[PDB]
Design a protein around this ligand. Structure first.
Ligand SMILES: Cc1cc(-c2cccnc2)[nH]n1
Length: 281
């Protein structure tokens, strides 16, 4: 039983796709697949798994199935009555955002406006999550996906494993994306995702760098709790960096909600001095 948006659902509400209709085409590093012919991504549950994994896999399907928003990956259905169990998801040809940013770093293509559109897309999905009282807890470039690599790309939130687990360790907590009250006190609110979004904004405008580059998790923990924050990414416009620093306010109630983040991102897309800024090679 999973609840969201004022309703409660169960494994039954999911759309079971008969296994015979599903064909795997590739590994994606998850598989590309066909459903008879719709092209999909296939998330597989290892047959070698515990019964916690089973519950976890099922809950992720229910979670994703109850979102209806263009910046959140669609769930096409499931194939749970055959082994290995499948979740069928929208196919995102552009791949994960972190890799796209690294592979697409300008070299001897990408402009500031393109980064702002990615930021806006994800902020729009986060707003929808906040409006529906869903806390993602793991907003980060590695969990975002792009429809296509070329122009006209749309970014969407593509993984919900963290929200499903707390619905798995200290050395596995995404400490570099978390605000103080989250890694000190275990408190998670919509303002937790606001902080993380600021880190994601830094990943975007650094073009896929690891946050707090030369620091370890514990060092970041002590840095952040002492009031330290990352410097601007190379060539980052001040209006964009100002969004990051607002997201990283020490007190959650001093951080903006996603309606205001979106507002400020759109104001950035309007500033020639911002969108005419050159990205570093
Ligand atoms: C859920 C999902 C994952 C993907 C994907 C990942 C990496 C490369 N290409 C596509 N598309 N859809």
């Amino acid at each position: 039983n999973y609840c969201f948006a004022g309703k409660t659902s169960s494994i039954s509400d999911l759309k079971e796709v008969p296994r015979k209709n599903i064909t795997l085409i590739r590994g994606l590093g998850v598989y590309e697949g066909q459903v008879s012919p719709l092209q999909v991504a296939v998330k597989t549950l290892p047959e070698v798994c515990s019964e916690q994994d089973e519950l976890d896999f099922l809950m992720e399907a229910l979670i994703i199935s109850k979102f209806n928003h263009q910046n959140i990956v669609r769930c096409i259905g499931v194939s749970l009555q055959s082994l290995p169990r499948f979740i069928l998801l929208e196919l995102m040809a552009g791949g994960d955002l972190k890799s796209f940013l690294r592979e697409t770093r300008p070299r001897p293509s990408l402009a500031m406006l393109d980064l702002l559109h990615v930021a806006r897309d994800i902020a729009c999905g986060c707003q929808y999550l906040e409006e529906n009282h869903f806390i993602h807890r793991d907003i980060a470039a590695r969990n975002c996906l792009l429809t296509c690599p070329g122009p006209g790309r749309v970014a969407k939130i593509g993984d919900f494993g963290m929200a499903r687990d707390i619905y798995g360790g200290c050395a596995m907590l995404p400490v570099k994306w978390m605000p103080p009250e989250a890694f000190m006190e275990g408190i998670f609110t919509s303002k937790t995702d606001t902080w993380s979004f600021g880190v994601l904004l830094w990943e975007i405008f650094s073009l896929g760098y690891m946050p707090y580059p030369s620091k370890s998790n514990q060092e970041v923990l002590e840095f952040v709790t002492s009031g330290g924050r990352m410097d601007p990414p190379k060539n980052c416009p001040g209006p964009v960096y100002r969004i990051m620093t607002q997201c990283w306010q020490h007190q959650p109630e001093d951080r903006p909600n996603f309606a205001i983040i979106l507002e400020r991102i759109e104001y950035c897309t309007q500033d020639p001095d911002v969108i005419n800024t050159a990205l570093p090679i």
